[model samples]
Target: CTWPAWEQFKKDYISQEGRVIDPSDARKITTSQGQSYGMFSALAANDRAAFDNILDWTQNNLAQGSLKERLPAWLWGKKENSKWEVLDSNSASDGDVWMAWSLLEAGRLWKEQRYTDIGSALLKRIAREEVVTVPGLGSMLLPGKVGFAEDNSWRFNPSYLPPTLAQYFTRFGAPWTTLRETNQRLLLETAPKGFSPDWVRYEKDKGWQLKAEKTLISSYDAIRVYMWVGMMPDSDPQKARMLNRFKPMATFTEKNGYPPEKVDVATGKAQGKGPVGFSAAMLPFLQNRDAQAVQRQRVADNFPGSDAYYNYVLTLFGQGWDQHRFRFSTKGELLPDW
Candidate 1:
């Protein structure tokens, strides 16, 4: 019934109004990522009060006081004139997916019909706006509602569709089922060298391509790919495939003694020292027993601090999993200890 990190998370980054603040940003933004992750944390902690607060804040601020009418906005923070509002109205499908998953799981675990209702609606909204059919890839999730689609080409983030979530959605059938297969290829084909890029593209008749500019560098976002893979249930069939495909990440982490800050996904070249969260993130993914133990010990030694919101979230997922705070069923059902 007690999760130490969740308690600390509420004390650190979460405001009384339920905003999960990224204090490092100049705008101190509360992203959909933050809200959705907070939902996950709250459910894991069995903190219904906090979950309601966060969900309320998200619906009010991010969805203009309601989710029934509109999907949640991705970014919300101070404006140039010091006004607090939605900076970008675009919907980031990953965050939406997380939010819906958390809501659905929360409803199921807590047995609240209201949460189920909202979660179901949100999923439909996401399907309406974010899901698209690629020429050869069938149905896939776009990075967002805007800017990701360029005529015949579409951009995607491999980390967006966490395998467990994808599996869970399969129960809904149709788009979710096909999306699962397409996303499988996304994770496997996109990471030719075992390093997932932050962003990639699929064009008409051209297939998958490394995204422009930052495509070469796998940092920040791509870390989730390893983390998600690590968290996948060993019993799940995709777990071994993902583990084998992403082995180079484990190899680099094991060899370097820590996860790299950035990696050139194309060439298998790692660079710089990553933050404490990286080690925390690799807890489940590291195949080498000793190296995995080292990471677990490392996280215990240099636990993420309060001000670092993203890092703390990463720790909550990694370290929390190691502690058996929560898990997923075969179809990605949220299986909490409580």
Candidate 2:
């Protein structure tokens, strides 16, 4: 009942004059939109043509741009008076990665190398431009420069941003050197400190610094860095540290549904709100759904995981490296194995 109204509202208001309306508005469709709708439509209709059209449109409209042609840092939507606004733009921080991911999936589905090629290029640009290029320090792939511009520095959001980036490189032949560099900066070097004893330090230069109260949202973001980059050789040491730090957080959750966002940094006890994205994202990983699928089929034939078994396994069953829980697998491997 409410879904139709929400859909109408989107078509009536959220969309601009003559602009094509995004089909799956939560307010309207309630369940499909973003990558979900894109993927569902493609498979439901077996409509490769429709899917390819959306893919081409996204690449041209969103990913193809210089630093200037692109939306402002952290912002998306459209440009304003010589400034890009990130509000509705597709090129925003995590949003850009999601866009590329969708395109990559479309490529795999349609057997279109161009989609994969373009998606890889976009990921590369993000690595070169947004990533922190310091040695010995892990990649601090944050949301944008504007927030950190006070000191002309970048603040790692500690979300799945870096992991997603790493996943792209690891799966798409993005070069081990690039992946290693990113892993070092993101996982090894830039650990979020404040909040509690276990609070991972997200800023730089100040070891164990606390800015404000921690939230489970940030903790999940922090732990995910370890989970994703642990795959990289450069991040091994930091990965161990991250796992140690995460132990207490996991324990606290067992006792209480809501886990504290901040840890004592000493006692490894929860100090704030619980029940964040961490608990939710972790569920799928624990279930081993994708792992079960991959083990059943020892070989994966796809663009991203062409010959890499581990990469295929992660891409197939792992939590999405980015915000949207959009999983990617070639058509040949979409079916459940016995």
Candidate 3:
């Protein structure tokens, strides 16, 4: 059955001008990440109008009126001067990849060459600017185009490397395939305890190291790692390996009543109760029928009432998957319900 969660998400969160507003913040900002995710959701629902609207706003505002020429900035909002403007010019690699992937899929599904051409161009820019060749990791995605690298050390967000997109990128050629391999290796190596970290640092000689700032905490950003992994098609050779590798979090969540808001990946210690969206994110990862049911109920109970922008977006992803609104093929093609 197709639920109307995606539609409700649009009604509650998206502006008529195509911006996804984070109501929780006073600044009422719109993020490239949010816009990209909205594009994905719109494509999944086969809502071409919404897709175009979102793409137009992103191109006009975040990309300085030209996505064809530059990567969109990560943040935009009302500044202290009461003007809506780009808050940060740094490009978020995850947002860029997601936007490219959505556009490419939309092009294929909708038979639009413009979408394909633009998406391909964006991918090239991403490869040129966001990906780096590490001494041990080959081509790895930096969290952003800048600030993530300094001296011999680079910071990476493992969750940002969605395996589905990596698999999809292989069609483009060499560096993408190399990137997919490196991302897979990074995901495996960083989560030795089976719980992903919010951020990881890699030194030219030391290899992968825990990010000093975040330490072992696995929360907001890391939760998507499990959601993305769980959404991988069963036919994907890497899916089984990924599931096996990240089983600890699933096991812990199943054993505990709910997922922890903060987890110490090193000690298996958890703190606080995760927001309702965390349980929703865990649904695909945890195979237990009873546990999945509990998560479904949790999402259903909290969804319409949730005021936090992040929680709503997470629910859109997790609950949208739970309802089978979209699926990824073994080859990484999106199979939207539409």
Candidate 4:
């Protein structure tokens, strides 16, 4: 399944001209920041040359306008008036963090200090400028102006970028404990009364945030955040609490033979529609230690997503991470610890 998608991605994005374009809109190609995810995924799959190709391709072709002068992101490939443009040059936190994660992975795999340096530099920028540190909760990215205005809220969605950045920070000997503590505080502060309850709330005073009553697609992405947080050294207390909360979700998956998109917080019953890709993503983390057979069975049932979602998840916490070749550790270390 991944093979076919990977082949298609290569054909569509990689070019003799040394440029990679976004498939959704060819005119809007991303910078090396977003491209790093693809490179890391290639590396993780043991496709060394593919990884190298992406690196060379990005380095040679990436837009080189000054960081501030440059569009916060990019718009490469063929130009389209209607296509999305990189907005907000004042900050590029989300894409930057992801890029940093990719660079960290690249550094580990390639033993290149340049990648480490770039990755670490990006982390500092994000930590200092992009992240907002609160006393109890560690830190959080300032919710985008539009996201906050529209939703009038804050949340730690699966796709939220801070945790990945924090993971890298901890791996590299940064003070990740402070950040994890912040994350735990935020998660608990936002969560409902009972543990494992569906709907990860944002602010209690503001009321239920994104009501993840049944299943929230974003929940799967959010898993990476907690998974890494739990692995951190100063996170034992939070980790224990999270384990208790997540156990029900894990149990539901066990009983149903697959993960639900969302489960009722109070009932512990599966709700809403489920995506195979989400369940598969959890394979690396949720599968029981003693249930290799069951894990294999579940993997067979996994669903594949579009090139973006597939590559994105694979880059971060794919089968390789689950198999122990890599770990999102406490020290913000991106290397394969297992």
From the highest lDDT down, the ranking of the candidates is: 1, 3, 4, 2
lDDT of 4 by residue, 145-261 (tens): 123312344444433443445544565443454665565554454434222332244453464453545443224444444344333344334455655555655666566665566
lDDT of 3 by residue, 89-198 (tens): 89988889999999999999999998999899999999998888888778888899899998799888888978999999999997998988988887888787788888
Candidate 2 to native Cα RMSD, angstroms: 11.0
RMSD (Cα, Å) of model 1: 1.2
lDDT of 2 by residue, 217-269 (tens): 34533544433432323333444454444444444544454335555443344
Each prediction's total of clashing residue pairs, residues at least 3 apart in sequence or on different chains, is 0, 40, 0, 18
> For residues 1-338, could you state the per-residue lDDT of candidate 1 as single tens digits?
77889998998889999999999999989999999999999999899999999999999999999877788999999999989999999999889999999999988888999999999899988888899888988898998998999889998998898999999998888789888888899999988788999888888998988643567567888898898988888788988988989998998889878999998877877889888888888987787899989888889998878678878998999888888888988879988887
Q: After superposition, which runs of candidate 2 have C-alpha atoms over 4 Å from their true positions?
A: 1-91, 135-140, 149-152, 162-185, 188-242, 257-278, 285-338
Tell me how far the alpha carbon of residue 255 in candidate 4 is from the true structure, in angstroms, after superposition: 1.5
Give the Cα lDDT of each candidate. 0.89, 0.39, 0.86, 0.49
Off by over 4 Å in 4: 1-36, 43-49, 52-95, 133-138, 143-167, 170-177, 193-220, 223-238, 264-269, 287-292, 301-308, 311-316, 328-330
Better of 1 and 3 by TM-score: 1
